[PDB]
Design a protein around this motif. Structure first.
Motif, PDB file in Angstrom:
ATOM      1  N   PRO A 596      -8.738   8.175 -36.471  1.00  0.00           N
ATOM      2  CA  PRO A 596      -8.077   6.905 -36.809  1.00  0.00           C
ATOM      3  C   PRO A 596      -8.625   5.712 -36.031  1.00  0.00           C
ATOM      4  CG  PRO A 596      -6.580   8.360 -35.633  1.00  0.00           C
ATOM      5  CD  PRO A 596      -7.755   9.168 -35.985  1.00  0.00           C
ATOM      6  N   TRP A 598      -8.489   2.023 -34.133  1.00  0.00           N
ATOM      7  CA  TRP A 598      -7.653   1.185 -33.289  1.00  0.00           C
ATOM      8  C   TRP A 598      -8.245  -0.211 -33.336  1.00  0.00           C
ATOM      9  CZ3 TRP A 598      -3.789   1.878 -29.151  1.00  0.00           C
ATOM     10  CH2 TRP A 598      -3.013   3.030 -29.356  1.00  0.00           C
ATOM     11  N   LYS A 617      -5.344   4.818 -40.457  1.00  0.00           N
ATOM     12  CA  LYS A 617      -5.459   6.267 -40.632  1.00  0.00           C
ATOM     13  C   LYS A 617      -5.790   6.595 -42.084  1.00  0.00           C
ATOM     14  CE  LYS A 617      -3.353   9.720 -37.893  1.00  0.00           C
ATOM     15  NZ  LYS A 617      -3.242   9.292 -36.481  1.00  0.00           N
ATOM     16  N   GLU A 664       1.697   0.624 -36.274  1.00  0.00           N
ATOM     17  CA  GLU A 664       1.743  -0.456 -35.292  1.00  0.00           C
ATOM     18  C   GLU A 664       1.392   0.053 -33.889  1.00  0.00           C
ATOM     19  OE1 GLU A 664       5.633  -2.224 -34.820  1.00  0.00           O
ATOM     20  OE2 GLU A 664       4.829  -3.797 -33.492  1.00  0.00           O
ATOM     21  N   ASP A 749       3.837  10.658 -34.034  1.00  0.00           N
ATOM     22  CA  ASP A 749       3.300  11.703 -34.896  1.00  0.00           C
ATOM     23  C   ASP A 749       4.379  12.651 -35.419  1.00  0.00           C
ATOM     24  OD1 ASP A 749       0.506  12.852 -35.812  1.00  0.00           O
ATOM     25  OD2 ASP A 749       1.675  14.583 -35.083  1.00  0.00           O
TER      26      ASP A 749
END
Ligand SMILES: O=S(=O)(Nc1cc(-c2ccccc2)cnc1Cl)c1ccccc1
Length: 862
Positions: A596, A598, A617, A664, A749
């Motif tokens: 993913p 950032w 993601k 977020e 998660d």
């Protein structure tokens, strides 16, 4: 002409489906929806362009207030629009925006040496570099932004924006210039099958059922066993034990094709009446859906992939020499108007009161509720759902009597109405009534339940329905509702069973806001670039080192096309958040499977508040994470309404496409695992691994600040302990638990919930017990305060247990693998102990908390 063509091409691009595909269907239902909804949405747009400036602020920047709002000294920084000069002044938390604005205007009048023409009633306060405003008759502490500034210790930064500047905003953003006599049994002809694939050693059978929602209107009927082949031929009559006069309006004919030595092949459903209430006759080719036996909750539209789909060819016989329509409301009311009223004893009235205030029933209790239906209406109107479940939907006269009462039924509370949207209430008049009782939802309540109402759209039998019109009118009256309605619909366009309905809803919305379509196109462009960037990172990461992949990612981001697409957009997670300058040097990716991204941003105009991050993601399904996070946010709202602030971190999570979405970034936070690595040459390096978290908190909160950091930890730990227990969040380890520098603990998660099936026990970790206890072995004063926070939080949720049950029941439509049946919702009934008194439930929670403490002690012993 030229602009209509451009808008059509921009809508096609945005929704991910060309508008020509809608016209290519040559479908009258699709055409009538498009015309009616285009008209309804354009009227909404014309109403908006004429709004007053404060009403336009309510449309575009709806107020973000603290749940409690629905004494203390405060420092505030105020500048005027276009000025590099600001004024820092002292107000009270109890002061209203107007007092602050009048204070800013006196300061400007002295600084600019003029007795000003402007009054404070002519302005609104913008939160700097955010699409957020402070206005109205509310004290400053009631605004989420100010409340946030107070808790974090930061100084609010506001801009005085004049009514004329807001009006220029509004103008810039404007759109450019008779059945009841038919007694014969219901029957169909099962002609043939096409493109069927099954083991040739077996036989094909078609199971047929008549349903009103989840309930059978009669017994199911099967075809004869025909030999397995590509084109099976039946050419036989299937007859049902139900008169054609007794078919309810929302009757669905359900099919299941299967192979027998059971082996499910496909399924298909259809409504017996069309969208114009006409009873269907003629040949019907049913493009079947693959089976993962009858599926009544399944869509009533055919599989769009006509090339690969199995198809059932059926014949609906011509039951009359003229078209037959379902009777109008007037004729139903005429029939239902007549019927003996309930005259019973006080003892039989006591038995009725016992069951209406109680939840399955025995046959004798059903006949009693139906007999006493008038008394249900007049003395127990909240028991409408019980009465609707005792109604015999397969008898048109019983349905007429129920419908007569419903049309005079008093409006129900929002909680009752959400239950009535369940697929167990398929009648269109019940549905219309439920929407009428939901019109009183505030924009904040509607936002809270938006995800569930969107899922309810998958249960709708027709395109043009009261729920779509309600959702469209509410989205066009509130930009934030509009924003999230668009994204929940957009994120499911890759799903063939909803792509048509969802694409048409997004087209209609776009007709109502041309400007917002362009704002959303900008968000889509960024997501398009992020996907290409993530694919590059997935490839590169497998061939070279992480600092090498990170540099190549930066180079790709530094390209003109990426810098343009990735900068100056509204966040899809929060339209109030502006993602201004992408901080390429700060961007990275995670080492996990899907790599993913950032992405970091900054904004000079927002200062520190402009420093925001997003996680992109691709490869994982984020729908369950979003649902769990929304449920935790609802818990937080319910606790704050009882004055309990457990310092939760309900961060944004939004699926945006096929296994694609955003999370977020919570800045100034780290996982428990990184902190517990106990790295050397760091401020937290511990003598004992148990000291690491407390040492990390000590380093982030020097001197007197440690006390409040331990307290934030304790509060959020109690909140998350209760939330993971109630929701059945398992697989909790050090890398999916995070801690903020403030001391706040939160979970990440959320791939598994509702016990997924092994019932999740209440969890207590000694590492956390250690911080709560301020680093002491025995500190029952602090520990038992913690247990009190847990108990108070738990008992508040139980009081709203029905709200969680009703929302989770609506979510069954989402198709989430961990939320498929009644067994999944049993978990929530058990965790909330709703079949018990508050005393019996609290006793049970105490048994589970003490059991978790004894489990935690197996770590304390060492
Ligand atoms: O792959 S991740 O980037 N996904 C993720 C990150 C966050 C997150 C949110 C606010 C701050 C920080 C991380 C939330 N949910 C998820 Cl699934 C991740 C990061 C760190 C540990 C484990 C997983």
């Amino acid at each position: 002409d030229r602009v209509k063509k451009l808008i059509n091409s921009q809508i096609s691009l945005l929704i991910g489906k060309g508008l020509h595909e809608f016209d290519s269907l040559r479908d009258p239902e699709v055409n009538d929806f498009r015309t009616k909804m285009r008209q309804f949405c354009e009227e909404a747009a014309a109403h908006r362009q004429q709004l007053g400036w404060v009403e336009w602020l309510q449309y575009s920047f709806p107020l973000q207030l603290e749940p409690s709002a629905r004494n203390r000294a405060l420092l505030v920084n105020v500048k005027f629009e276009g000025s590099e000069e600001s004024f820092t002044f002292q107000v009270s938390t109890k002061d209203m925006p107007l007092a602050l604005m009048a204070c800013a205007l006196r300061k400007k009048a002295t600084v600019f040496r003029q007795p000003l023409v402007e009054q404070p009633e002519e302005y609104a306060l913008q939160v700097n570099g955010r699409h957020e405003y402070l206005y109205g008759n509310y004290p400053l502490c009631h605004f989420q932004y100010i409340c946030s500034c107070l808790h974090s210790g930061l100084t609010p930064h506001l801009t005085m924006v004049h009514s004329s500047s807001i009006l220029a905003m509004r103008d810039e953003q404007s759109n450019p210039a008779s059945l009841w006599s038919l007694e014969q049994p219901f029957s169909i002809e099962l002609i043939e099958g096409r493109k069927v694939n099954a083991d040739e050693r077996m036989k094909l059978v078609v199971q047929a059922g008549l349903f009103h929602g989840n309930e059978m209107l009669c017994k199911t009927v099967s075809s004869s066993e025909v030999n397995v082949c590509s084109e099976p031929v039946w050419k036989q009559r299937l007859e049902f034990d139900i008169s054609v006069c007794d078919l309810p309006r929302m009757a669905r004919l359900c099919f299941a094709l299967y192979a027998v030595v059971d082996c499910p092949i496909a399924w298909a459903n259809l409504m017996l009446f069309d969208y114009k209430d006409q009873l269907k006759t003629g040949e019907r080719c049913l493009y079947m859906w693959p089976s993962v036996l009858l599926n009544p909750a399944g869509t009533v539209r055919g599989n769009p992939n006509t090339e690969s789909a199995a198809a059932l060819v059926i014949y609906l016989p011509e039951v009359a020499p003229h078209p037959v329509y379902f009777p109008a409301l007037e004729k139903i009311l005429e029939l239902g108007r007549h019927g003996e009223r309930g005259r019973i004893t006080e003892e039989e009235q006591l038995q009725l009161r016992e069951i209406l205030e109680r939840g399955e029933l025995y046959e004798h209790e059903k006949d009693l509720v139906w007999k006493m239906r008038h008394e249900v209406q007049e003395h127990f109107p909240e028991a409408l759902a019980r009465l609707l479940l005792v109604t015999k939907w397969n008898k048109h006269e019983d349905v007429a009597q129920m419908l007569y009462l419903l049309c005079s039924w008093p409006e129900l509370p929002v909680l009752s109405a959400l239950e009535l949207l369940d697929f167990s209430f398929p009648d269109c008049y019940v549905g219309s009534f439920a929407i009428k009782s939901l019109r009183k939802l505030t924009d904040d309540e509607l936002f809270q339940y938006l995800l569930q109402l969107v899922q309810v759209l998958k249960y709708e039998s027709y395109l043009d329905c009261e729920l779509t019109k309600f959702l469209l009118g509410r989205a066009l009256a509130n930009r934030k509702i509009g924003h999230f309605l668009f994204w929940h619909l957009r994120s499911e366009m890759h799903v063939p069973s909803v792509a048509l309905r969802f694409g048409l809803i997004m087209e209609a919305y776009c007709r109502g806001s041309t400007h917002h379509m362009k704002v959303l196109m900008k968000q889509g462009e960024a997501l398009s670039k992020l996907k290409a960037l993530n694919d590059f990172v997935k490839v590169s990461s497998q061939k070279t080192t992480k600092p090498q992949t990170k540099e190549m990612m930066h180079m790709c981001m530094r390209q003109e096309t990426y810098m343009e697409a990735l900068s100056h957009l509204q966040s899809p997670l929060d339209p109030s958040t502006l993602l201004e300058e992408v901080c390429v040097e700060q961007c990275t990716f995670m080492d996990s499977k899907m790599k993913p991204l950032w992405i970091m941003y900054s904004s000079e105009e927002a200062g520190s508040a402009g420093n925001v991050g997003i996680i992109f993601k691709n490869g994982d399904d984020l729908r369950q994470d979003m649902l769990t996070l929304q449920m935790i946010q609802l818990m937080d709202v319910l606790w704050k309404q009882e004055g309990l602030d457990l310092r939760m971190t309900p961060y944004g999570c939004l699926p945006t496409g096929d296994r694609t979405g955003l999370i977020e970034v919570v800045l100034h936070s780290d996982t428990i695992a990184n902190i517990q690595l106990n790295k050397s040459n760091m401020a937290a390096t511990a003598a004992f691994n148990k000291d690491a978290l407390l040492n990390w908190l000590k380093s982030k909160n020097p001197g007197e600040a440690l006390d409040r950091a331990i307290e934030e930890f304790t509060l959020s730990c109690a909140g998350y302990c209760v939330a993971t227990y109630v929701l059945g969040i398992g697989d909790r380890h050090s890398d999916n638990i995070m801690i903020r520098e403030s001391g706040q603990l939160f979970h990440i998660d959320f791939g598994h919930f509702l016990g997924n099936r092994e019932r999740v026990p209440f969890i207590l970790t000694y590492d956390f017990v250690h911080v709560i206890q301020q680093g002491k072995t025995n500190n029952s004063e602090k520990f038992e305060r913690f247990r009190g926070y847990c108990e108070r939080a738990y008992t508040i949720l139980r009081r709203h247990g029905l709200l969680f049950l009703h929302l989770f029941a609506l979510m069954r439509a989402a198709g989430l693998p961990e939320l498929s049946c009644s067994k999944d919702i049993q978990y929530l009934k058990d965790s909330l102990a709703l079949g018990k008194t508050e005393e019996e439930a609290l006793k049970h929670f105490r048994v589970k908390f003490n059991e978790a403490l004894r489990e935690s002690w197996k770590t304390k012993v060492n």
